[PDB]
Predict the 3D structure of the following.
Amino acid sequence: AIPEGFSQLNWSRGFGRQIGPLFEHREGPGQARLAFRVEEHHTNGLGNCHGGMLMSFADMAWGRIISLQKSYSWVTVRLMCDFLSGAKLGDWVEGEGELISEEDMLFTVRGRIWAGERTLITGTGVFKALSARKPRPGELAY
Amino acid sequence: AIPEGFSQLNWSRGFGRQIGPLFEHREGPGQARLAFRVEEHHTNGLGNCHGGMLMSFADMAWGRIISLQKSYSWVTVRLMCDFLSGAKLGDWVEGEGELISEEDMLFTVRGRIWAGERTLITGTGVFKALSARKPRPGELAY
């Protein structure tokens, strides 16, 4: 029962699959959102989401902006996260960034991660767009 | 062939196992260091370590300070990472923090992650120590 508007992302290999399952919001309003359900392999072994998981999730959730806007490959240059509250096993966690500025292909994204009415993380990411790649469904270039 | 001074950390479940294998430095000089070898499940599918992996690794590497000093459970309150260079498949990556200050159980740790002579990440973590837990071998309380 995936929350309305979301569909599962599918990787075959690499780090996204290690930390999945992750979900992306469909095209239109809320498209910039990713989500995940806290599962045992996300946790600290004690029923709570590991903060390292939430940072990895913020990295991907907030960088999603650049993918959608440009369909460029990109790399994190800076990531800053303040942790306000925790997530537990089975929480539906969501993440989104807002694109504030771009200078010479450095995109600054202000971001949040939340689980319902609880804000888990507030922070800022700076991502460097590298070069054009094959567009993916839902991206502007697709 | 684990680099001299390191032994594999072993988890049975949870997020550390998802992102392993990780290694910890033996007791004595360098004890505060963790390490990992970049494997395919760490990468971006293109031979390079995902930046989200490196942040998760920094979280655990830099918080290791509190574990060693206190054998307290702890939680990340703030994590800030500037990414200077990338790691590739098969690189031996190491991470360590230096404990700068403590106020009322918030421990501020200045940190680095490196692969040989390359610094991958410089940053700062603030960790909140929560309560005593069972000491682990190599920790001060053990």
